[PDB]
Design an enzyme around this catalytic site. Structure first.
Site, PDB file in Angstrom:
ATOM      1  N   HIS A  41       0.809  -1.219   0.000  1.00  0.00           N
ATOM      2  CA  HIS A  41       0.000   0.000   0.000  1.00  0.00           C
ATOM      3  C   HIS A  41       0.841   1.267   0.000  1.00  0.00           C
ATOM      4  O   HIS A  41       0.266   2.363  -0.022  1.00  0.00           O
ATOM      5  CB  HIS A  41      -0.996   0.019   1.169  1.00  0.00           C
ATOM      6  CG  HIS A  41      -0.377   0.205   2.526  1.00  0.00           C
ATOM      7  ND1 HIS A  41      -0.266  -0.822   3.439  1.00  0.00           N
ATOM      8  CD2 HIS A  41       0.110   1.310   3.144  1.00  0.00           C
ATOM      9  CE1 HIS A  41       0.285  -0.364   4.551  1.00  0.00           C
ATOM     10  NE2 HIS A  41       0.527   0.925   4.396  1.00  0.00           N
ATOM     11  N   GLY A 143       3.339   5.602  10.140  1.00  0.00           N
ATOM     12  CA  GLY A 143       4.640   5.405   9.543  1.00  0.00           C
ATOM     13  C   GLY A 143       5.341   4.124   9.940  1.00  0.00           C
ATOM     14  O   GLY A 143       6.465   3.894   9.483  1.00  0.00           O
ATOM     15  N   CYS A 145       4.436   1.046   9.238  1.00  0.00           N
ATOM     16  CA  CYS A 145       4.266  -0.056   8.309  1.00  0.00           C
ATOM     17  C   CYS A 145       5.599  -0.486   7.720  1.00  0.00           C
ATOM     18  O   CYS A 145       6.485   0.334   7.435  1.00  0.00           O
ATOM     19  CB  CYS A 145       3.296   0.337   7.193  1.00  0.00           C
ATOM     20  SG  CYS A 145       1.628   0.257   7.797  1.00  0.00           S
TER      21      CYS A 145
HETATM   22  C1  LIG Z   1       1.493   1.952   8.270  1.00  0.00           C
HETATM   23  N1  LIG Z   1       2.349   2.875   8.147  1.00  0.00           N
HETATM   24  C2  LIG Z   1       0.127   2.241   8.870  1.00  0.00           C
HETATM   25  C3  LIG Z   1       0.182   1.849  10.347  1.00  0.00           C
HETATM   26  C4  LIG Z   1      -1.123   2.263  11.082  1.00  0.00           C
HETATM   27  C5  LIG Z   1      -1.256   3.615  11.043  1.00  0.00           C
HETATM   28  C6  LIG Z   1      -1.999   3.986  12.379  1.00  0.00           C
HETATM   29  N2  LIG Z   1      -1.536   2.853  13.404  1.00  0.00           N
HETATM   30  C7  LIG Z   1      -1.021   1.832  12.642  1.00  0.00           C
HETATM   31  O1  LIG Z   1      -0.585   0.803  13.062  1.00  0.00           O
HETATM   32  N3  LIG Z   1      -0.945   1.476   8.196  1.00  0.00           N
HETATM   33  C8  LIG Z   1      -2.147   2.146   7.656  1.00  0.00           C
HETATM   34  O2  LIG Z   1      -2.308   3.327   7.770  1.00  0.00           O
HETATM   35  C9  LIG Z   1      -3.204   1.275   6.987  1.00  0.00           C
HETATM   36  C10 LIG Z   1      -3.259   1.477   5.459  1.00  0.00           C
HETATM   37  C11 LIG Z   1      -4.147   0.421   4.816  1.00  0.00           C
HETATM   38  C12 LIG Z   1      -3.455  -0.927   4.901  1.00  0.00           C
HETATM   39  C13 LIG Z   1      -4.457   0.786   3.337  1.00  0.00           C
HETATM   40  N4  LIG Z   1      -4.501   1.611   7.512  1.00  0.00           N
HETATM   41  C14 LIG Z   1      -4.785   1.432   8.927  1.00  0.00           C
HETATM   42  O3  LIG Z   1      -3.936   1.023   9.685  1.00  0.00           O
HETATM   43  C15 LIG Z   1      -6.212   1.800   9.433  1.00  0.00           C
HETATM   44  C16 LIG Z   1      -7.321   1.478   8.656  1.00  0.00           C
HETATM   45  C17 LIG Z   1      -8.598   1.825   9.124  1.00  0.00           C
HETATM   46  C18 LIG Z   1      -8.737   2.467  10.368  1.00  0.00           C
HETATM   47  C19 LIG Z   1     -10.157   2.850  10.870  1.00  0.00           C
HETATM   48  C20 LIG Z   1     -11.131   3.212   9.922  1.00  0.00           C
HETATM   49  C21 LIG Z   1     -12.419   3.574  10.341  1.00  0.00           C
HETATM   50  C22 LIG Z   1     -12.728   3.570  11.714  1.00  0.00           C
HETATM   51  C23 LIG Z   1     -11.775   3.223  12.637  1.00  0.00           C
HETATM   52  C24 LIG Z   1     -12.440   3.333  13.910  1.00  0.00           C
HETATM   53  N5  LIG Z   1     -13.697   3.724  13.704  1.00  0.00           N
HETATM   54  N6  LIG Z   1     -13.876   3.866  12.401  1.00  0.00           N
HETATM   55  C25 LIG Z   1     -15.134   4.288  11.771  1.00  0.00           C
HETATM   56  C26 LIG Z   1     -10.455   2.853  12.213  1.00  0.00           C
HETATM   57  C27 LIG Z   1      -7.641   2.783  11.128  1.00  0.00           C
HETATM   58  C28 LIG Z   1      -6.347   2.442  10.650  1.00  0.00           C
HETATM   59  F1  LIG Z   1      -5.223   2.742  11.376  1.00  0.00           F
END
Ligand SMILES: *C(=N)[C@H](C[C@@H]1CCNC1=O)NC(=O)[C@H](CC(C)C)NC(=O)c1ccc(-c2ccc3c(cnn3C)c2)cc1F
Lengths: 301, 302
Positions: A41, A143, A145
């Site tokens: 991603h 950051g 990831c």
């Molecule tokens: C990598 N660098 C990051 C690590 C994340 C960032 C925040 N804490 C971590 O461990 N990975 C991401 O940002 C990924 C990207 C994807 C794989 C495309 N996304 C997430 O970790 C992510 C996805 C969804 C939520 C989320 C969404 C809607 C929500 C939530 C709670 N309530 N609602 C309506 C949470 C959070 C999230 F960190």
């Protein structure tokens, strides 16, 4: 003596961490021989992550869209491919710090060390377990990831985890180094729930043995139980069942303490039914389930 | 929040073994000097009642075996500084990081790289207890393992392990060889005094709870520093210093809660208890996270 949550020394992994940038998106990569592994991603924009068609996005990228940095040295990308949720970047230099390594897929209950990194730079190290519901209870910020989990045996690093995402509940999800998620999760920017988690019973028992080895014995009792009656109570309390293989791998701790595994099981059954009553075990008010039998034997022998 | 160690690689590159006769322990190789516990020059029988000056005058450079793995580093000088032995070697360590030797205060945390025969085995986080012991994890052969913090790219070494006490806690020195606490490197009955709770770290933990939205325990009062110290001592809590108030400054500003207001809230927690409620999910107050650790874990650290 003493007993602490303990991670593997992280140097061999620190020598492999790099920064990977595509557009405005930066995260960490793992550089082994002439290949950099990172979460796919990185190729997404913020609008891409809502419903990404990864194969379309990757076919529209070229090698020069990827900026790889090892410290202050830019590594030239000369190829790229995708394996499940992991992007693989061939670079034109082999990492001289590459350790002996393997890629493994771990089982629930098994522990590993995490080197949390930001912008390709190591930040901290800590010990984690694969939960029964295939999340991990990690500590990760924006950051992070591409940070990896690993175990070390002699001089060989077995990589088992790469970090991809955080769930609404605060727990974390990621892949093995073939890019396959642990658990029913997807690398999309959506709120995802896990299955209800359970406690890792064999690990709780190992930790109770550790407590006895370090002089905490208040929870012991004269009673024993059968394996089946233990498992009936364990399942009532959302604990994983104990297998005969689990009993066997607890053998060394049983012999070291002189406490049969099923005697310790009767102690744990009492703790589940009655609670701790304001008392603590090894300083904890909750039953700890992220030490394996191997971890306890390693730290107590 | 979770105990996490600093990445250990910069310290791993400095670990060596030091052997005298059949006694082997760990040493720290920085530039062309190796630092290790002076009791390496003792036999087990010597440890009951050692005369270190007399034992060391009988030693020459050629009695010390220093090894980086299987590679011997020839010793070309030796001296004793308090309880540390310093061996000048003929090779400057190419992996020497930027470093400093620091002497820490009770309550400060650090990472320990536990080593056996110069080989790193594990890393974990420790706090110096107010009674100058650490609740570490050490086996036989771990002596000479070090504790450290990392600031930017600079390793601050603060602990070298020397001994286990009857209660199973551990004692050691700074890197100038001065013990933390009233302990000595002699194989006698030594007792750590009764320990106390690290107030400044409990306050850090409470600030961390507030930052995460868990703030039921905030009351409408303030207190003086003197009054709080006098009350806290009655609960086996350490009194605060001016330095403690200073290092809580950033968390106080981040939350808008004066240090003395938080002290009054903690005072209420001590006098009244938790009443079956929790803070950050826990029924116990945590006292081994410093204000710096809270900021670390909540923000981007290197
Ligand atoms: C990598 N660098 C990051 C690590 C994340 C960032 C925040 N804490 C971590 O461990 N990975 C991401 O940002 C990924 C990207 C994807 C794989 C495309 N996304 C997430 O970790 C992510 C996805 C969804 C939520 C989320 C969404 C809607 C929500 C939530 C709670 N309530 N609602 C309506 C949470 C959070 C999230 F960190």
């Amino acid at each position: 003596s003493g007993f602490r949550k303990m991670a593997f020394p992280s140097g061999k992994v620190e020598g492999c961490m790099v920064q990977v940038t595509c557009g405005t998106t930066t995260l960490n990569g793992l550089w082994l021989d002439d290949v950099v592994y990172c979460p796919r991603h990185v190729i997404c924009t913020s609008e891409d992550m809502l419903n990404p068609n990864y194969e379309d996005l990757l076919i529209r990228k070229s090698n020069h869209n990827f900026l790889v940095q090892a410290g202050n040295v830019q590594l030239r990308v000369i190829g790229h491919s995708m394996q499940n949720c992991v992007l693989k970047l061939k670079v034109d230099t082999a990492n001289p710090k590459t350790p002996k390594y393997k890629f493994v897929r771990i089982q629930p209950g098994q522990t590993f060390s995490v080197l949390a990194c930001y912008n390709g730079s190591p930040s901290g190290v800590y010990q984690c377990a694969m939960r029964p519901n295939f999340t991990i209870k990690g500590s990760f910020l924006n950051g992070s990831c591409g940070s990896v989990g690993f175990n070390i045996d002699y001089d060989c690093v077995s990589f088992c985890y790469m970090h991809h995402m955080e769930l609404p509940t605060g727990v974390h999800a990621g892949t093995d180094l073939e890019g396959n998620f642990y658990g029913p999760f997807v690398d999309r920017q959506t709120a995802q729930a896990a299955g209800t988690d359970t406690t890792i019973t064999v690990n709780v028992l190992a930790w109770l043995y550790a407590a006895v080895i370090n002089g905490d014995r208040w929870f012991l009792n004269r009673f024993t139980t059968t394996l089946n009656d233990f498992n009936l109570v364990a399942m009532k309390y959302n604990y994983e069942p104990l297998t005969q293989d689990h009993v066997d791998i607890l053998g060394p701790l049983s012999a070291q303490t002189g406490i049969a595994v099923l005697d310790m099981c009767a102690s744990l059954k009492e703790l589940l039914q009655n609670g701790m009553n304001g008392r603590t075990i090894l300083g904890s008010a909750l039953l700890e389930d992220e030490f394996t039998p191997f971890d306890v034997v390693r730290q107590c022998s």
